[PDB]
């Protein structure tokens, strides 16, 4: 973690902005939390910032024999040493791991999941496990779906362990309205190819894209070799390698995905207090997204996803919340402009009316993003072959245009609504210059 926080710069949101997620709340849902008593016992880590502690799967017990759910929780926000991004953010878990170690207690509609969050506080909800289905958008996919689009909640899932093969996303993190994630290396080098540069891709990380053929994941995050809060239940064949008594190392898309969960904390407060808006879901994906770092492997691509986050970026993006709505044929127009010399990433991100289980495409409300340089050439959302207007999306709720060098002079960003059946339709946008 305290590697992981250099390399997504948490450090920098921390350091400079002043950014440890003060006043967020974050949910988590996992095997269980430590001893599974909110009292003097917890784990140094989450003792007296538990804002609730449910036991779903095993009466009475929330407990954390396995290891999984303590470990993932320590990332997003634990506040003694090998601290969380997000140190000062209040936690609610809900314990879903049952008497045979199985998930048992996730509830068979999972809006009653995020809607027990969402009551406790919480506005994240970070989910480290899947169902590895090959891509599939499942029922459970889908009410991940309709609660983002309804609800103020920034949902995460990781997108599994089933790498290096495409076409190996895990449920729900196939989800539209989701940020999931793949997990890059760790830098910690003596330990040591699976953890030797911030660049690699880890084998097991699950890979796009989705049956739809979306981009899926989102982005990227350590999750090798991921020093974090050890349960005092958890025996050691659950770690990748001991460290001491209160702490160890696991590595895992799941351990990516509170990487992440943490940097939307951080980057949730900085725009209520510093910006004046509280982000929707759709603005939190796409300055992520926007701010994110090519490994090296382009794009598009299911390996990498949009990148490796990047947190410092993501901070003071210029950007749409959400506030123009769109009915089919309308467009919004606005107008940016643009210094030569730095690149300049534009991230269309839209909450999607929840897809079928069973169509061809799961995308229901089509936007459209349509770049315009000083010059007349033109970009559309996605397209990364010269020349970059031919091929338009038709499966995405993410939609980008990414120029290296730019021209100096003003851009026009058009996002234009070409086929909402389920209107209007809200988005967001982010600007990285
Ligand atoms: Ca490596
Ligand atoms: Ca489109
Ligand atoms: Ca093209």
Redo the contacts with the bound molecule.
Sequence with gaps: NDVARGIVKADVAQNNFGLYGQGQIVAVADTGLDTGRNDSSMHEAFRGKITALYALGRTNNANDPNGHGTHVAGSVLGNATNKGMAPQANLVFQSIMDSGGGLGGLPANLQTLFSQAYSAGARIHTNSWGAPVNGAYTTDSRNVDDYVRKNDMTILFAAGNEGPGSGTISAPGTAKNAITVGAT?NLRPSFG?????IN?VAQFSSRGPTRDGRIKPDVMAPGTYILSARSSLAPDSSFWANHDSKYAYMGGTSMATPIVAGNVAQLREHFVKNRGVTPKPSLLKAALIAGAADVGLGFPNGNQGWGRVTLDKSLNVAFVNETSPLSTSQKATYSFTAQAGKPLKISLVWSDAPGSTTASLTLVNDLDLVITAPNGTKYVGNDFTAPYDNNWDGRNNVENVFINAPQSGTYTVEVQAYNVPVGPQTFSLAIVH
């Excluded at 190819?193 to 540069?197: E, F, I, T, V």
């Design positions: 290396e190819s699976y953890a030797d540069n690699h």
